[PDB]
Write a protein that binds this ligand. Structure first.
Ligand SMILES: C[As](C)(=O)[O-]
Ligand SMILES: C[As](C)(=O)[O-]
Ligand SMILES: [Cl-]
Ligand SMILES: [Zn+2]
Ligand SMILES: [Zn+2]
Length: 451
């Protein structure tokens, strides 16, 4: 735990739509003061410790609503320890891990178990979505809603147990369960029709370029449209994950603020960064579900971040070993790591005018905290937890085998040089990462607290 008063002195702060020179005083685990302007040379406000931040940008730490840290049961790929270290190195100070582990997080015992793993091993603050299945409605009703961000349903991509296809079950969940429902929307019936066409016409060895043709725009839109109708029918709280298409944007609104919406959306950095033009170069290293699709889709998603149709930005960090990423679009695993570099990638798009720094902070910190009703995080406000990231906009960072932290040991950004680097990351006032190196000691971490 931190017990010291630590002054982050003369940073360029971005918070709540404003960017301004200022200093932030940390007192133990909390932000105690924000001091606008440039403190004169001699003035350290009686801090116990000072970090000189001139030239650095200071943001609230990113809060990521969708990661897959592969624990329990898939730990050859990753662990909560390994990936939360990668997260802090990327300026992500809170994460929400998904229930598709082995065993899946579909009963209360499993959720409590993951919370203990977090307490014992995470380097960032932690939360865990509860999983819905065709068979666990009774478990869902007994979920303490303070202890999870919501319920995750896989309406596609998943198989058997984790695939919620039972229509009576979906109606029952939406109509009976009082929590936020996050959905993965791809219509498997459409994907299968497309798979049949492409296999019949082009054969069994279909490469990556068939991936967005099989897991098509219409397969995403049809699933999302059906989820939206069901949520409207029940006045349910629905949060559609990882939007990948322009077409889906018509299902969302930007006439009201996120806090008022019953139906919200998330986009992930890879869908904001990559397009299908990148398949030639990167191949399976950018194979994801939902698939990376057209340049025009990427353009529409960027616009929707700016206009508000997309509520938040996340990663869908989902490591696999490279031996699992091998083969055809039918054999290779979908998913890859992103959390160590996603903030740098967003900041690179800000250098290009695609987003403002203010929007990126809103979408990665402010709005995730608002949307999931997370207590005392996501904002640089007095009394909030000191989850903070300092970035250096004039110190490039090149991604290499040597500096990748994810256990899987590769990155879709391998070889890329970002203009920005992460200079420092604080988690609950504990310095967790500084100048390319994880701290000697794990920071104090907490479960995220919801409502
Ligand atoms: C001018 As000074 C010592 O506050 O960087
Ligand atoms: C991680 As999935 C089963 O939503 O592609
Ligand atoms: Cl990465
Ligand atoms: Zn998904
Ligand atoms: Zn996911």
């Amino acid at each position: 735990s931190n017990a010291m008063k630590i002054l982050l002195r003369n940073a360029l702060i971005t918070n709540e739509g404003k960017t301004f020179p200022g200093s932030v005083m940390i007192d133990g685990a909390f932000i105690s003061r924000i001091i606008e302007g440039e403190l004169p040379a001699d003035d350290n406000l009686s801090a116990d410790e000072v970090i000189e931040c001139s030239g650095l940008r200071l943001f609230p730490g990113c809060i990521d609503d969708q990661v897959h840290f592969r624990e329990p049961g898939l730990t050859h790929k990753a662990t909560i320890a390994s990936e939360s270290r990668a997260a802090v190195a990327g300026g992500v100070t809170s994460f929400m891990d998904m229930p598709n582990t082995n065993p899946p997080t579909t009963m209360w015992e499993r959720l409590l178990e993951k919370r203990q793993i977090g307490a014992d091993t995470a380097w960032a603050n932690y939360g865990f979505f509860f999983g819905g299945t065709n068979d666990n409605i009774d478990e869902i009703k007994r979920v303490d809603k303070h202890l999870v961000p919501g319920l995750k349903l896989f309406l596609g991509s998943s198989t058997g147990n984790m695939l919620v296809d039972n229509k009576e079950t979906l109606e029952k969940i939406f109509g009976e369960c009082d929590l936020l429902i996050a959905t993965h929307c791809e219509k498997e019936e459409i994907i299968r029709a497309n798979k049949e066409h492409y296999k019949a016409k082009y054969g069994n060895d279909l490469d990556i370029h068939f991936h967005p043709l099989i897991r098509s725009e219409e397969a995403c839109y049809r699933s999302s449209a059906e989820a939206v109708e069901l949520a409207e029918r029940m006045n349910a709280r629905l949060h559609i994950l990882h939007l990948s298409t322009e077409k889906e944007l018509s299902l969302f609104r930007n006439d009201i603020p996120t806090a008022q919406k019953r139906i919200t959306s998330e986009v992930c950095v890879h869908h904001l960064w990559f397009s299908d033009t990148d398949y030639g170069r990167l191949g399976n290293r950018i194979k994801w579900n939902p698939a990376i699709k057209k340049e025009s889709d990427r353009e529409a998603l960027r616009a929707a971040v700016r206009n508000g149709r997309i509520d938040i930005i996340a990663t869908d960090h989902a490591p696999h070993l490279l031996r699992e990423k091998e083969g055809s679009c039918l054999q290779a695993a979908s998913g890859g790591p992103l959390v160590q570099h996603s903030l740098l990638a967003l900041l690179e798009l800000c250098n290009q005018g695609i987003f403002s720094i203010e929007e990126i902070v809103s979408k990665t910190a402010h709005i995730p905290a608002t949307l999931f009703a997370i207590e005392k995080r996501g904002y640089i406000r007095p009394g909030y937890y000191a989850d903070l990231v300092l970035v250096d906009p004039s110190s490039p960072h090149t991604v290499s085998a040597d500096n990748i932290l994810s256990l899987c040991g590769w990155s879709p950004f391998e070889g890329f040089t970002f203009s920005h680097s992460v200079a420092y990351t604080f988690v609950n006032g504990c310095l967790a990462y500084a100048k390319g190196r994880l701290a000697e000691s794990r920071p104090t971490v907490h479960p995220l607290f919801f409502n």
